[PDB]
Design a protein around this ligand. Sequence first.
Ligand SMILES: *[C@@H]1O[C@H](CO[C@H]2O[C@@H](C)[C@@H](O)[C@@H](O)[C@@H]2O)[C@@H](O[C@@H]2O[C@H](CO)[C@@H](O)[C@H](O)[C@H]2NC(C)=O)[C@H](O)[C@H]1NC(C)=O
Ligand SMILES: *[C@@H]1O[C@H](CO[C@H]2O[C@@H](C)[C@@H](O)[C@@H](O)[C@@H]2O)[C@@H](O[C@@H]2O[C@H](CO)[C@@H](O)[C@H](O)[C@H]2NC(C)=O)[C@H](O)[C@H]1NC(C)=O
Ligand SMILES: *[C@@H]1O[C@H](CO)[C@@H](O)[C@H](O)[C@H]1NC(C)=O
Ligand SMILES: *[C@@H]1O[C@H](CO)[C@@H](O)[C@H](O)[C@H]1NC(C)=O
Ligand SMILES: [Zn+2]
Ligand SMILES: [Zn+2]
Ligand SMILES: [Zn+2]
Ligand SMILES: [Zn+2]
Ligand SMILES: [Zn+2]
Ligand SMILES: [Zn+2]
Ligand SMILES: [Zn+2]
Ligand SMILES: [Zn+2]
Ligand SMILES: [Zn+2]
Ligand SMILES: [Zn+2]
Lengths: 126, 126
Amino acid sequence: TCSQDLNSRVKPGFPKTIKTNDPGVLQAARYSVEKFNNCTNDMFLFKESRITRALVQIVKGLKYMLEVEIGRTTCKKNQHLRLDDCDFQTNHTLKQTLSCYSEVWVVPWLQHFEVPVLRCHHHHHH
Amino acid sequence: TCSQDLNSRVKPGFPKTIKTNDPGVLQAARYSVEKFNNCTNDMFLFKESRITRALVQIVKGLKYMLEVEIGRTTCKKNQHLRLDDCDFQTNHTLKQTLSCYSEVWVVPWLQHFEVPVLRCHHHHHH
Ligand SMILES: *[C@@H]1O[C@H](CO[C@H]2O[C@@H](C)[C@@H](O)[C@@H](O)[C@@H]2O)[C@@H](O[C@@H]2O[C@H](CO)[C@@H](O)[C@H](O)[C@H]2NC(C)=O)[C@H](O)[C@H]1NC(C)=O
Ligand SMILES: *[C@@H]1O[C@H](CO[C@H]2O[C@@H](C)[C@@H](O)[C@@H](O)[C@@H]2O)[C@@H](O[C@@H]2O[C@H](CO)[C@@H](O)[C@H](O)[C@H]2NC(C)=O)[C@H](O)[C@H]1NC(C)=O
Ligand SMILES: *[C@@H]1O[C@H](CO)[C@@H](O)[C@H](O)[C@H]1NC(C)=O
Ligand SMILES: *[C@@H]1O[C@H](CO)[C@@H](O)[C@H](O)[C@H]1NC(C)=O
Ligand SMILES: [Zn+2]
Ligand SMILES: [Zn+2]
Ligand SMILES: [Zn+2]
Ligand SMILES: [Zn+2]
Ligand SMILES: [Zn+2]
Ligand SMILES: [Zn+2]
Ligand SMILES: [Zn+2]
Ligand SMILES: [Zn+2]
Ligand SMILES: [Zn+2]
Ligand SMILES: [Zn+2]
């Protein structure tokens, strides 16, 4: 499986630290939680709640490597609700947070984004 | 394409800096150049020459993210030659170096390694 770029015209980028409030980082964390909502069957939408760590790598575009917390909101899935206007669950029985790692590839000049990696963990209540 | 680990039993690891002379890093850089030799058709084998940057991430094993330089050796390909005993080209017309980025996944308890990403650049002689 030699599907590699082994004679690249550009020197490949290495991941570098980036501020966790960088507008690009913030948008990448939104993509991540949207990938999560798309890929699960909760009755509520989740929303990014905290970005603890972030790296960005140049690869024909921007690849974000993110450590992001996501939380259940009070907005139901499948009602065409926008996450910017969703607040987190207050009800303790409905409060749920996950710790995720994601990689998000964004090519703004081609209007393209992808979330090729998303790993999430809900910690046991014991 | 929801082929993700979204209900993981473990909190996912984030990539952390690791020393570029760490024995695991050194072995990962060897895997990278071996992936390079496997995936190209030079008449000589290449060998890792310098590891400039390294991150390691815990993901059911160790994933290395490496910035590694590779160089052409005087050992011919397809002669069953071991890289530890190969020295770099002296002949200026045969000297060739590439800057690579690689990701190498190693699971030592399962005797498994993989090089899922390798990107390499030969800088123009102008
Ligand atoms: C967004 O999700 C759909 C997958 O449909 C999914 O429903 C989720 C809630 C979850 O349970 C998931 O496991 C389930 O498959 C994706 O479309 C699906 O993709 C797979 C593989 O490509 C196809 O085999 C399915 O037929 C297809 N189903 C439908 C209804 O479209 C979609 O790819 C995904 N998008 C992204 C970008 O993640
Ligand atoms: C190691 O390389 C071989 C690929 O054979 C290659 O020869 C190289 C020098 C290079 O020119 C490359 O582009 C060429 O394909 C891999 O086996 C091949 O894999 C592909 C896809 O899996 C198959 O379609 C080929 O039929 C198959 N060919 C042979 C002769 O086996 C092999 O996967 C690769 N190994 C690794 C781990 O990178
Ligand atoms: C919280 O949610 C549960 C289940 O939907 C419900 O039984 C309970 O009444 C709710 N409590 C409050 C105060 O909203
Ligand atoms: C270097 O290699 C080239 C091509 O193989 C050859 O023409 C030349 O004689 C070599 N020079 C020396 C000093 O080895
Ligand atoms: Zn809609
Ligand atoms: Zn609000
Ligand atoms: Zn919980
Ligand atoms: Zn697109
Ligand atoms: Zn936990
Ligand atoms: Zn052999
Ligand atoms: Zn020697
Ligand atoms: Zn050169
Ligand atoms: Zn294996
Ligand atoms: Zn260059």
